Amino acid sequence: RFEDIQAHYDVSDDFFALFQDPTRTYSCAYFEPPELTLEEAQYAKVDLNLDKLDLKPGMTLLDIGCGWGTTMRRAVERFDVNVIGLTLSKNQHARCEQVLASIDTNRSRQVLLQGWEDFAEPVDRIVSIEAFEHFGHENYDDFFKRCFNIMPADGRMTVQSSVSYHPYEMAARGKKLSFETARFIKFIVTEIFPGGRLPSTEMMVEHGEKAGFTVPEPLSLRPHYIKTLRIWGDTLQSNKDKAIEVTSEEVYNRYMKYLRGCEHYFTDEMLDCSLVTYLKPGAAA
């Protein structure tokens, strides 16, 4: 019923290749230093996350929403860790198995076509980059409980997610822009990421705390997502003819509206992107 209707907004991987960097990373890049290319910035964002997790050789890293396996490969090469990836995409599953098999290592590498709900194996650390927007508000308590329970006493997790604000969090300016932002968010979670639901930073923090995690000050990636969306927009536009051939004028116009729109609402500070760290009680100092 709902599975069938949402399929209308399926877009071929070929289309995404006409705006993303060569790693096909579909998340906020990290321009530190500011001079980095998009591709360099995507590796920098992976490092930003992994560097927060206190990874030691022989640990197992869980990647929840492991995409094309860029994060897991980087984790194996830099930290000499075992990796388990979760994805719902058959295409990403096959690509991840090949990426991980390519690696010159004796470390265990596993990728699973399943959600976090089905995953209940012990792991040392957890990374999740822009998968959280799909989980749904009713599932946040189960998600943080699962993540707490599968990790050892010194466990750590990062969740990177786009966020909005509740009107109760906003002054007169934000409240007045709330209707326009809410209508744009509805478009994103209907036509770009079907079934999606944006949290707030406050929700991401308070749900982690309720599960027993210590939550330091979240990092805002807002200026980095503005730069990311600018490059994605400029690249898609430079590839207009090829993008329309691969899909349609409708699909091209849809993603230009998405990319230009997100850059606008990030700039107007009605959207944010939070990298939140979750530390278990026994986490190393």
Ligand X SMILES: Cc1cc2nc(N)[nH]c2cc1C
Question: Given the rule CB under 6 A, which residues bind ligand X?
Answer: 130, 133-134, 162, 187-189, 191, 193, 196, 198, 253-254, 257, 262, 271
Residues facing residue 157 across a β-bridge: 126, 278
Catalytic (active-site) positions: 262
Taking the complex as a whole, the smallest distance from the CB of residue 227 to ligand X amounts, in Å, to 14
Residues facing residue 63 across a β-bridge: 85, 127
Length of the chain: 285
Among residues 23 and 162, whose Cβ is nearest to ligand X?
162
Backbone angles phi, psi at 70, to 5 degrees: -60, -45
88 among the known binding-site residues? yes
Residue found under tokens 């923090």: 205
Taking the complex as a whole, the smallest distance from the CB of residue 266 to ligand X amounts, in Å, to 7
Among residues 100 and 163, whose Cβ is nearest to ligand X?
163
116 among the known binding-site residues? yes
Taking the complex as a whole, the smallest distance from the CB of residue 46 to ligand X amounts, in Å, to 17
Taking the complex as a whole, the smallest distance from the CB of residue 187 to ligand X amounts, in Å, to 5
Among residues 191 and 269, whose Cβ is nearest to ligand X?
191
- The tokens describing 152, both together, are 């050892």
From CA 61, how far away is CA 76, in angstroms rounded? 9
273 among the known binding-site residues? no
Among residues 72 and 188, whose Cβ is nearest to ligand X?
188
162 among the known binding-site residues? no
Backbone angles phi, psi at 119, to 5 degrees: -100, 120
Side-chain-side CA neighbours of residue 16 (13 Å)? 13
- The tokens describing 72, both together, are 């897991």
Taking the complex as a whole, the smallest distance from the CB of residue 41 to ligand X amounts, in Å, to 16
Contact 45, 29 (CB under 8 A): yes
- Three-state DSSP class for 154? coil
Among residues 132 and 213, whose Cβ is nearest to ligand X?
132
129 among the known binding-site residues? yes
67 among the known binding-site residues? yes
From CA 62, how far away is CA 85, in angstroms rounded? 6
Closest CA to 282 of 186, 152, 172: 152
Q: Is 2 exposed, middle or buried (0-12, 13-18, 19+ CB in 10 A)?
A: exposed
Feature table: binding site: 26-27, 65-67, 87-92, 116-117, 129
Feature table: binding site for S-adenosyl-L-methionine: 26-27, 65-67, 87-92, 116-117, 129
